[model samples]
Target chain A: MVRIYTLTLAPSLDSATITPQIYPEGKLRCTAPVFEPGGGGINVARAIAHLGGSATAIFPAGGATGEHLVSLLADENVPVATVEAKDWTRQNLHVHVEASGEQYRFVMPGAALNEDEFRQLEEQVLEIESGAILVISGSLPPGVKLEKLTQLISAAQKQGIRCIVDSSGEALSAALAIGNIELVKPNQKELSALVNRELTQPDDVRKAAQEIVNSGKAKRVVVSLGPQGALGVDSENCIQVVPPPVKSQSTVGAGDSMVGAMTLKLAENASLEEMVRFGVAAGSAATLNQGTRLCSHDDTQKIYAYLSR
Target chain B: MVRIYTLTLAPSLDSATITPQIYPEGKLRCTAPVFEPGGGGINVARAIAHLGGSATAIFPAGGATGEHLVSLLADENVPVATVEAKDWTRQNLHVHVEASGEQYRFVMPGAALNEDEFRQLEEQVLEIESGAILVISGSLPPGVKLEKLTQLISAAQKQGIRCIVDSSGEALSAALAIGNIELVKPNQKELSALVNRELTQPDDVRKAAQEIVNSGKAKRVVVSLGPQGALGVDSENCIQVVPPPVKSQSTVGAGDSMVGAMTLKLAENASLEEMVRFGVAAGSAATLNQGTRLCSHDDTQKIYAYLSR
Candidate 1:
């Protein structure tokens, strides 16, 4: 078992419904609302929990919606340490129009985190065990500076904690610039954007992943290739693991499952090849389920057994 | 002051935001979400709260969204008596497409209330003081029978409480058929639907209002005429109150404002004439604001003072 802690800056109470049709100025009556706890780091924690492990989730919750988010996390049996926020936590909507067979997602900008709240968040981070694996995922809520995330990563590093990041754009680049991230799981598209060039072949992908490791940007870079599986790159090992063909339902939390699996294996001091295969298996397992259920230990084990062959 | 107790079987956390454009299968970025407590009875309570008075809102609250709804009402300073539910509360969304100045409203079927919850709701109603006016508004939530509402009104009537109903379709018809209500306020369309004829003249509306009263459906019936103002009718009185036109904005909560003002006046033991005029002023005052601000005390008082002249 691994002692892991995940942090989410902008968590949401995700509600989904289905309507027969959608049109402007018309009253669109929908099906019963389904609530799901969501956000990058929280979903990662959920994946870890689903994989038969437990991780503490640290996130700011406020107002009624924020209160709901906390309850939802608890309902999922995930451990939580909440930092109170001043603004209402966001509620996201996903409407599946059955007539069109398309889903409409309405995302709210996260609650603003004032300076005092940021202080609380940092305080929560410092309280984690020194050697625990720290996973910082999700976008920065309003009023939080990217430098704050960088600072958190720095604080974790000083305490001998390995930090894993799964953020995009400026936050991602800033984390990489710190040159202390233990792992970063970016998809092929994200890696291509970071390298400022198209990576069309497996070799190009490996080199880009290698470049991040060589620059000390990350100790390991995992690039996810849809359908073709994923590639794991480190100082001395470069392994590509292909996932077996399966009927895919949804890819909402596949990446988080991959990260969760890899981190759990790292805690066990597993080989890089073993980590890549397990990560690929978990990612594929997540795709087998609809919505954000992530990966189940049963499915992961079955897929991993197949990959071992 | 007359005590006012409002009941809403279905309540919602109404969230509104603006998007630049809306198109199919395209990502629509929106402004930060804004939440408001919504449902006819709650809005009536909120309007009364805005008008420097207080009313107790009695409703079924369930799950996270229900929890959020209660807090939101408290944030607006509306007192509430709640019945716990098994299902999560529903949330409604309103998106204003900035480019076209069009709004899209997505309403959810609220939490399903089981028989146990329904019994609890009835028990909550029984707890309210007998002489207080009961304003039962909004639709019956899924799984709640219309007979339950009729029974609630009958129970209120047996005590000294006056029941004012503002619902549509079968609920409205069923309430009127019971004929024990003190007041029933319906818009022209709804009134016309009840009478099974379009009312184009003031006399036509007055006679329809009189007909409901004649059948013992209610002691009074007020017909709301958009732009033309409103008409009040009872056994011995038929008076029409015309509102001074102001710049009209959204009419979202206008009806609730009217009901709230009339109930407030009834609490003061005001005359039928004063009730109609004050209710008209409040309803028109509500249209002066955009969206769901309801009627401010200043606007209501100003309009009432003008009507006094």
Candidate 2:
């Protein structure tokens, strides 16, 4: 198996709890909070590990919160390479109101990374050997320029390392513009944003994904279609993989699970069809779990078999 | 000055932030969270420190959250003696809704302490020297029996330590029942619950407080009456200290500020009238600040002078 490394620039310690009801100007007694390590690449690494694969998570952590995040990863036995940050990592809260069955998510601004911190993070990430899979995921922290991401991608490509990017807004566009990425996964909304149009139909999504692949921006493009599974496109193929319906308790880590599985399949040199099928299965399986929990290997296998049949 | 030690059985790392609005099933981007050490006894120690008085805070802390709480106290220059707990400490979140100018507090259940952990905490609390004022404040964690609290109070009083308790429900009642308590500070609601009556009138409040004092349950009974200030009742006299009206922002730590000031005055061996006056002033001063901040020395001094005049 190929070595896989995931980088999350703005990671957080995510906590989830439930309250009977939510009202203004009152204290809502909540259940004990459950904490998990969070961020795009962090979740991807965790998901990959859960799927019986190995991946190293590289991130910047600082203060007590950062230390806690690293310890949480260690508890799960996820391999990590950490850079010391000057500021504490951020924490996000997810509160589920039992009365309304609705969740309230409070997201905090991540710690700012100064120039020196960014350089240190880049150095740690670049230390991965050649022929390794480098997944650059998650939002940029304050004080980090888009140029830093593009520069990292440029350097990794030159060193014969495969790069996978899963982000949103200007970061995703900027990473795609750098070209030569091994794979790029964006949901329907993100794909539409990139192509400057609404991708409502299946054909629209396929064409948009094909455009990115044909432009040499990425070797492959995958558009996650939510409940409808995902669409994959490359130089000579456009494949759609739809899984059997499963009760989705939450959609928190579905995208990351998909990215993790696809990266694993890419490492195994699986066909485009097989990669998309396995990715959708893993994503749907993730939704079966509550809160920030990702897909389980058993559930993913069952869904994958159903999709294949 | 006599030594003061405050014990918090259920402490928390309180985080406060603000969002534009709050709704269900949506992500709310909030401002950076401000973390503070919180709990009745912890806040009392912090308030005492802010008032230029020295006090040591003792509490059970475990895991990263506990370490973070201790570090926050260290940053505020509040002395602490921590007992190692097996479970991680709890965290509470306070979110201010900018649209409605209302705050929503999510309180989590504290870490449970098994029998062994409880004994460790008791050992730390009992280590304080004789003649020191021992303030037992906040709720009881899971697995800690009410007998443990009464036993601690009984043991401390036997060792020549003056005990002060500021809690509600059964814990406060049980502590008071142990007798020989130097002081017991209860808000109007809590006082009413303890006396099993509706203390709506000032005379009714005074009589109820006097009853507790006459029974030798406590040497003094201080009832915090919110905006109306506090009522102090001892064996000899009943003194009502009403603070001058001021702009009140948040009442988060007002009660703890009162307890802190009263405990400091008790250490100084001040008169009952002086203690109540300063306690009410500090409480009112706490309202001038936002979030979980305690009273400033400048504000407390101004309020105290106004009350005295």
Candidate 3:
């Protein structure tokens, strides 16, 4: 059995709700908010848990927020291996209008990792077995350089382990400069930030994705487009594209669903299309929910049948 | 400066959100949820904190859910005292549709309070000094009896201290039978439940309300009438009708807010009409919020202006 692990630099209790009256220093009238344990890699672990696969969710936990988040994941039956942090992880807000679906998010600045903390995180990454797939997702706190990720990827590379990175900014560049990860997923906006260009057009994005592949830093590149679909390229498929679904509620965790569905299949040695198809299914299933619940196996099949091969 | 304490026998981190889809057992797409510390009494304390008034929030707190609840309040700068319990207080869901003003609440069954634990709660209520208002909001857990509230009311009566009850069902009747409560804020449905008669007209509801007054138990009774207005009676006012504003969010914690605003003012010994006006301001403010974030001072004033002799 393959041992897989997902890493979240800083995980938080993701509380999303449509409380139209969220004025700071004003009396708060929160329409009911949908609460979920959230972080990029955490979502992937959650998706994996739903798939009946157990992946150790490795993340720093702290104060009250972290403890509650860890318990929430446990209640969801996702196995956890928490790294303790001194500071409290944040509680992010996603407030939407009760009519137009317009959203306004209030995100806190993440926690900064000191050198010792970074070293401990590195140790946790190395703990993964030789054949295990190590997937890193979401943003990092300030001062956690790309070098931090590069070191981890380098360890996986030496072990012949596959490492997929789905993050942007300095962290993305750092992983690239190290030239070791198996694959990287960056949406157009993230891709632009990494490549320091617009990369708005599909062709433009494809070219930038190709450049990352050419650099030998990563073996493959994947780009996601909400509703339009997702594209990925590597030695085997060269390029794979999956179009959007027939119906969806809103794409809150669609991308993470994609990552979770695809990565799990990849770790299990599934085919290229199976990997892409599951990702699409997971993404589409998540759209069925109005708030924070994620895509499940049933919806995956529902969306898969409608998915164009 | 009289010391006042507010308590919610049960409290949870309010996870309200706009989920694009609702998740089924395993495959629904869920996203990060916006979590707030939520409970009727807790929200009241939040309002008091927002108004720069200080009051201690006391209740059973433990496990991850209970622990996070305490911190959630501290994050909001509310003073609190906890009689830690063994069971984890669960998270409650309040989902608000971004496309419509509808709300769906999925409240989890709270931690079951054991008998010994129950006594400690009663003792906690007894510990509050004379003249302090012990606000007992939220329903008692399943297996806990309404008679427990009567016991609490009797204790408050013994100390000559005023107890305000904010609960419904059999507990309201039990509390009313014991009598001598400073205030009982029940909405139209709760009022209807107390009388065991369906509300056909204002008089039907008022007649039911009159029974509570006739009990000679509580010196005052405040019955909330959704958009119709609030019907209240005490020594100062034979029957004071405080009308509500236009349509707004669900009437979740609106009554709790009315109790909080009035008690806060009454404990200060504010006059009848002044207390009602302040309370009307709060009830109007309650409309400004959809769920647990109850009442804004500014919104309250706008409605308070509409009230005249």
Candidate 4:
């Protein structure tokens, strides 16, 4: 079996707390916080584990909060490989205001990794065997250059390891510019930013995603369109998968769930159409849960079956 | 050496993060958080430790956050006695907006301790060897009855222990109503609320505090007057100690430092005038530091020397 290795350069020990309301200058008394291990790649790895598969989550962790994040990951039995950092890991706040049923996320800039620490992470990535799949997800922390990531992607490509890039902003554009990624996942806004165009329609989205595939930049491109489900394109196939309506308790982990399911299917060498169907199903399943709870295997399977019909 | 025992019914693992700005619907990127152990009694105990005195802080601990708080306390080498609770400990956020130079604190209602947990804490309190002075500080968490605290104070008094109550609202009122406390520390506003009248002058503040002392409700009443320093009254003495003016950094732990210094002096059987002078110095010293940083022994002594001159 091919192993999945997910890289979150900066992961967070997320605190999800609920408040009746949020008012400035007043002591907004929240409920006891629920701590969760979170980041783009960490969530993807967690979602994979929830789907009865396991992935190794690699990240640089430091200080007490970093140790706390590691222990939380351990409790969930997620495989972790942490590189020690000089600064403490960042902790993000996710405030769920019960009155509005909306979440306000306050994300912190992660601790900067020294050059030596960054090299250690690169060394760890290079040490992963050729047969495993490498998924680089989440934003890069400070002191991490885009050139380093491009080098890592090139090195993995040379080893014939399938590489998946799921990130936003400069990281996504940089990865696409370097080319040769097995898969790239971006939401509508990110996709638009990547192609530098407005994608207001499904056809526009499909064309924008296909442009990356056409440039031979990525073997496949998956674009998440929120409630409209997802669109995927490759050299020989273009497919759209619309999800069944889900009463979204929270949308925190939907995209990561989609990426996790798609990566699982890709590792299995499933067809492009089948991959999007399962990916869309998993994304929908993730919406049914609250906070950082991702897709469960049972729910994912049920949604997949419904979409298959 | 006489030991001080401080009780924090609701303790928090407080995280202070700095952000450039805060805007609705925008992702506020904050700097890495600085985590500290915080609560009324915890701060008091920490301040005492900083002043080269040791106080054992007793509070109910639960979940990962509770353990984190314990480790923070250990780092400072503050002695701790933790009673286990069922639910996870609560975490609070303090966001310092760098642009506005303002700090917003979001407090959380800690995990509700069951009857068994509350009883365990009370038992722990009662079991502490008799010579230590007991300081009940901070607000009680939900599910904790004021009657339970009254019982504990009454029991401590029975063992010839000096009990200090430093809280506001119903707990302060209840402690005063129960009428066996060695001391009760309240600010100008709290004294007004307790007496059901406005106390804007030093004479008025002295008279109201003396009323509590004369009624045999409490042995002494200390009223904090912010920049005017503090007013203290007992059966025979009505004295006011004014603080030396210093550039205020943050007032987060000033009150706790005041209480810690006062408790230390009381334990040493110092004169009431000397106690309030030291306390006012300590409180002023606390304002010389940032965030939750309390008073240091050197700063306290320096301020004390100035005030004494």
- What DockQ does every candidate get? 0.37, 0.60, 0.05, 0.35
- Give me the candidate number with maximum lDDT: 2
What TM-score, to 2 decimals, does candidate 3 have? Answer: 0.65
TM-score of 2: 0.86
Per-residue alpha-carbon lDDT of model 2 for B1-309, expressed as tens digits? Answer: 899999999989898998999886566989988888988899999999989999999998988889999999988899999989988888899999899877889999878988988888778877878899988889888888989889988988888888999998888899988887899999988998998898767489888988998899999999998888988988998888887867778887899999999999999999999999999999999988876679989999998998888
Better of 2 and 3 by TM-score: 2
If you assessed candidate 1 against the hidden native complex, which CAPRI class would it receive? acceptable
Cα lDDT tens digits, model 4, A1-309, are: 699999999888888888887764445777767788888899999999988888999999988789889998888889988899988788888787788877777888877888899888888888888878988988888888888888888887787777899998988998888797889989888989999978777479889888899998999999998888998999999888998876777777788999999999988889999999999999999988667888989999999999998
* TM-score (all chains, Cα) for each model: 0.75, 0.86, 0.65, 0.76
- Candidate 1, B137-160: lDDT as tens digits: 887798888888888878878877
Question: In angstroms, how far off is B206's CA in candidate 2?
Answer: 6.0
What interface RMSD does each of the candidate structures achieve?
Answer: 2.7, 1.5, 12.3, 3.0
Q: Who is ahead in lDDT, 2 or 3?
A: 2
lDDT of 3 by residue, A213-275 (tens): 877877777777667667777655654555553666666787788888778888888766666
Error of 2 at B257 (Å): 1.1
Worst lDDT 10-window in candidate 1 chain A: A101-110
Clash pairs (backbone) in predicted model 2:
none
Docking class of 2: medium
Consecutive 10-residue window with the lowest summed lDDT within model 3 chain B: B22-31
